Enzyme design. Structure first.
Site, PDB file in Angstrom:
ATOM      1  N   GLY A 163     -41.335  54.251  85.442  1.00  0.00           N
ATOM      2  CA  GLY A 163     -41.050  55.480  84.719  1.00  0.00           C
ATOM      3  C   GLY A 163     -41.797  56.612  85.384  1.00  0.00           C
ATOM      4  O   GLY A 163     -42.424  56.393  86.422  1.00  0.00           O
ATOM      5  N   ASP A 175     -43.902  70.115  65.606  1.00  0.00           N
ATOM      6  CA  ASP A 175     -43.852  69.678  64.223  1.00  0.00           C
ATOM      7  C   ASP A 175     -45.218  69.364  63.621  1.00  0.00           C
ATOM      8  O   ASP A 175     -45.482  69.817  62.507  1.00  0.00           O
ATOM      9  CB  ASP A 175     -42.962  68.443  64.133  1.00  0.00           C
ATOM     10  CG  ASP A 175     -41.521  68.724  64.573  1.00  0.00           C
ATOM     11  OD1 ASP A 175     -41.032  69.838  64.282  1.00  0.00           O
ATOM     12  OD2 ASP A 175     -40.920  67.811  65.179  1.00  0.00           O
ATOM     13  N   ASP A 178     -44.677  56.428  81.345  1.00  0.00           N
ATOM     14  CA  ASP A 178     -43.756  57.327  80.631  1.00  0.00           C
ATOM     15  C   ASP A 178     -43.617  57.052  79.143  1.00  0.00           C
ATOM     16  O   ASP A 178     -43.316  55.919  78.773  1.00  0.00           O
ATOM     17  CB  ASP A 178     -42.309  57.138  81.117  1.00  0.00           C
ATOM     18  CG  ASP A 178     -41.290  58.195  80.662  1.00  0.00           C
ATOM     19  OD1 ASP A 178     -41.614  59.026  79.787  1.00  0.00           O
ATOM     20  OD2 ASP A 178     -40.179  58.165  81.233  1.00  0.00           O
ATOM     21  N   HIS A 192     -49.577  45.212  74.608  1.00  0.00           N
ATOM     22  CA  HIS A 192     -49.141  44.117  73.727  1.00  0.00           C
ATOM     23  C   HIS A 192     -50.183  43.007  73.476  1.00  0.00           C
ATOM     24  O   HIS A 192     -50.689  42.370  74.397  1.00  0.00           O
ATOM     25  CB  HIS A 192     -47.833  43.528  74.269  1.00  0.00           C
ATOM     26  CG  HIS A 192     -46.671  44.475  74.080  1.00  0.00           C
ATOM     27  ND1 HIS A 192     -45.874  44.796  75.168  1.00  0.00           N
ATOM     28  CD2 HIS A 192     -46.251  45.112  72.940  1.00  0.00           C
ATOM     29  CE1 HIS A 192     -45.008  45.636  74.590  1.00  0.00           C
ATOM     30  NE2 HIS A 192     -45.152  45.900  73.283  1.00  0.00           N
ATOM     31  N   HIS A 229     -50.379  51.441  76.553  1.00  0.00           N
ATOM     32  CA  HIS A 229     -49.276  50.657  77.136  1.00  0.00           C
ATOM     33  C   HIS A 229     -49.305  50.788  78.650  1.00  0.00           C
ATOM     34  O   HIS A 229     -49.333  49.760  79.326  1.00  0.00           O
ATOM     35  CB  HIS A 229     -47.855  51.056  76.678  1.00  0.00           C
ATOM     36  CG  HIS A 229     -47.209  50.092  75.710  1.00  0.00           C
ATOM     37  ND1 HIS A 229     -45.852  49.843  75.867  1.00  0.00           N
ATOM     38  CD2 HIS A 229     -47.744  49.351  74.686  1.00  0.00           C
ATOM     39  CE1 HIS A 229     -45.671  48.912  74.930  1.00  0.00           C
ATOM     40  NE2 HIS A 229     -46.719  48.552  74.172  1.00  0.00           N
ATOM     41  N   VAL A 251     -41.432  54.310  63.742  1.00  0.00           N
ATOM     42  CA  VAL A 251     -42.164  54.496  64.939  1.00  0.00           C
ATOM     43  C   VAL A 251     -41.373  55.549  65.660  1.00  0.00           C
ATOM     44  O   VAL A 251     -40.605  56.336  65.076  1.00  0.00           O
ATOM     45  CB  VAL A 251     -42.534  53.267  65.749  1.00  0.00           C
ATOM     46  CG1 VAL A 251     -43.505  52.553  64.813  1.00  0.00           C
ATOM     47  CG2 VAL A 251     -41.289  52.589  66.273  1.00  0.00           C
ATOM     48  N   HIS A 282     -50.103  53.748  71.651  1.00  0.00           N
ATOM     49  CA  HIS A 282     -49.151  52.803  72.166  1.00  0.00           C
ATOM     50  C   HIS A 282     -48.787  53.143  73.601  1.00  0.00           C
ATOM     51  O   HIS A 282     -49.022  52.290  74.435  1.00  0.00           O
ATOM     52  CB  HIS A 282     -47.936  52.798  71.253  1.00  0.00           C
ATOM     53  CG  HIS A 282     -46.832  51.898  71.723  1.00  0.00           C
ATOM     54  ND1 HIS A 282     -45.845  52.417  72.550  1.00  0.00           N
ATOM     55  CD2 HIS A 282     -46.635  50.575  71.450  1.00  0.00           C
ATOM     56  CE1 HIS A 282     -45.091  51.326  72.717  1.00  0.00           C
ATOM     57  NE2 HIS A 282     -45.464  50.194  72.100  1.00  0.00           N
ATOM     58  N   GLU A 283     -48.265  54.341  73.899  1.00  0.00           N
ATOM     59  CA  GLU A 283     -47.984  54.792  75.268  1.00  0.00           C
ATOM     60  C   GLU A 283     -49.160  54.655  76.234  1.00  0.00           C
ATOM     61  O   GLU A 283     -49.061  53.988  77.248  1.00  0.00           O
ATOM     62  CB  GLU A 283     -47.618  56.282  75.234  1.00  0.00           C
ATOM     63  CG  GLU A 283     -47.853  57.127  76.506  1.00  0.00           C
ATOM     64  CD  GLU A 283     -47.108  56.750  77.778  1.00  0.00           C
ATOM     65  OE1 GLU A 283     -46.921  55.544  78.051  1.00  0.00           O
ATOM     66  OE2 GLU A 283     -46.711  57.718  78.455  1.00  0.00           O
TER      67      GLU A 283
END
Ligand SMILES: CC(C)C[C@H](CC(=O)NO)C(=O)N[C@@H](CC(C)C)C(=O)N[C@@H](Cc1ccccc1)C(N)=O
Ligand SMILES: [Ca+2]
Ligand SMILES: [Zn+2]
Ligand SMILES: [Zn+2]
Length: 166
Positions: free
Chosen positions: A91, A25, A95, A129, A123, A81, A119-120
């Site tokens: 994960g 996309d 993951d 966080h 993360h 999001v 973020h991933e």
């Protein structure tokens, strides 16, 4: 919280990512670029050197999906999001699943495959966080996506100062 010292669950300061799939996309090509950019300054901060899959397994692999899969965050469809990600070790190590529900966009965001990446990617390792202005933790895609020098979380950067073991 993850991270530090001498790094997470890696004995290298030269790691990789893998867009398992890449939802076509943004395009698929600009989704790779959404991720690959994120990566790039995450490698300026820590000693690490991220890049796409050199071989084997990776650090944070990502597949697109969540048209409505139901993992962590919401399959919200194009707009909002999108990553329904969970940690390094836990994960498929690092993951993250990115709304293939979207029509990846960067129209301020809408949704851009870049922050699901940030973020991933942040993360997993452990820049996981916080609450700041510029951070990967600045918590809603309308980001400081100037990934020339994005300048990650300054607190979750104090964890990238661990990645940075060497
Ligand atoms: C990548 C980073 C931006 C993720 C953040 C913050 C975070 O770290 N959560 O764990 C997030 O999930 N924000 C969601 C929370 C939840 C839906 C999972 C949110 O507020 N999303 C907006 C999406 C949005 C985007 C652009 C404009 C307007 C609204 C919303 N659903 O109101
Ligand atoms: Ca969405
Ligand atoms: Zn999922
Ligand atoms: Zn989060």
């Amino acid at each position: 919280f993850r991270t530090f010292p001498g790094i997470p669950k890696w004995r290298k300061t030269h790691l990789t990512y893998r867009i398992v799939n890449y939802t076509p996309d943004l395009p698929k090509d600009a989704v790779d670029s959404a991720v690959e950019k994120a990566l790039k300054v995450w490698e300026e901060v820590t000693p690490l050197t991220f890049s796409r899959l050199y071989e084997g397994e990776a650090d944070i692999m990502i597949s697109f999906a969540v048209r409505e899969h139901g993992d962590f965050y919401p399959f919200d469809g194009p707009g909002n999001v999108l990553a329904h990600a969970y940690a390094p070790g836990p994960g498929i190590n690092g993951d993250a699943h990115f709304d293939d529900d979207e029509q990846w966009t960067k129209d301020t965001t809408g949704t851009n495959l870049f922050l699901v990446a940030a973020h991933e990617i942040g993360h997993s390792l452990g820049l996981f966080h916080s609450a700041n202005t510029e951070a990967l933790m600045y918590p809603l895609y309308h980001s400081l996506t100037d990934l020339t020098r994005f300048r990650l979380s300054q607190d979750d950067i104090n964890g990238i100062q661990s990645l940075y073991g060497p």
